[PDB]
Amino acid sequence: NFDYMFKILIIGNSSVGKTSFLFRYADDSFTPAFVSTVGIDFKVKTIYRNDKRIKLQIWDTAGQERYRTITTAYYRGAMGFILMYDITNEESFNAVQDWSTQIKTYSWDNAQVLLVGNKCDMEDERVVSSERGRQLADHLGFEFFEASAKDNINVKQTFERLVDVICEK
């Protein structure tokens, strides 16, 4: 049913929009409701790149600290990570460094990572500049993206770039 299968994990503080990000990408759907993820969830999505069928096993992790042990247990085997924060939430941005270290502690075999500042549609409520996001991504050695699960801005682009760097690894 596939030529390659890439395991991808979406991590970051609770409420940054990780589930919404996946919901938009996999089902082209979005819900304004906040239904916190219990531990970890996943969605499989088959994409077609260079005439090849790549199965994307996407794990949607819970952001709350109490689920750290449950979620980090899935880091090994992950080939790509979407480290997400909310442009309207400073605390979620300040947590990026620690999320980055978490990836280093539990990930294996040079997993690829993209830093994503979600909810970019909330321009009037923005608290973290794109400049700061880009600057942190650079220092962490990650490529940067700002996106919107709500307005469907850069969700596909984010996932496709991740698939590219994983494939070209």
Ligand X SMILES: Nc1nc2c(ncn2[C@@H]2O[C@H](COP(=O)(O)OP(=O)(O)NP(=O)(O)O)[C@@H](O)[C@H]2O)c(=O)[nH]1
| Residue 29 in contact with ligand X, rule: CB under 6 A | no
Neighbours of 30 (CB within 10 A): 17
Q: Rounded to an integer, what is the distance from CA 66 to the centroid of its chain?
A: 19
Question: Least Å distance between CB 49 and ligand X?
Answer: 25
Q: Is 16 annotated as a binding residue?
A: yes
Among 9, 54, 59, 63, binds ligand X (CB under 6 A): 63
Q: Is 121 annotated as a binding residue?
A: yes
Q: Which is nearer to Mg ion, 19 or 71 (CB)?
A: 19
Residues in contact with ligand X, counted by CB under 6 A, come to a total of 23
Q: What span, in angstroms and rounded, lies between the C-alpha atoms of 77 and 23?
A: 23
Q: Is 149 annotated as a binding residue?
A: yes
**Looking at 34-42, 50-58, 135-143, 159-167, which segment touches ligand X (CB under 6 A)?**
34-42
Question: Least Å distance between CB 64 and Mg ion?
Answer: 9
Q: What span, in angstroms and rounded, lies between the C-alpha atoms of 36 and 142?
A: 27
Q: What span, in angstroms and rounded, lies between the C-alpha atoms of 39 and 18?
A: 13
- SS3 of residue 129 by DSSP: coil
**Looking at 42-50, 62-70, 133-141, 159-167, which segment touches ligand X (CB under 6 A)?**
62-70
Query: What single-letter amino acid sits at 22?
Result: L
| 159 neighbors 165 (Cβ within 8 angstroms) | no
**Site map (CB under 5 A) of Mg ion, residues 14-43, x = contact:** -----x-----------------x------
Q: What span, in angstroms and rounded, lies between the C-alpha atoms of 61 and 113?
A: 15
Q: Binding residues for Mg ion, per CB under 5 A?
A: 19, 37
- Residue ranges of the binding site for Mg(2+): 19, 37, 60
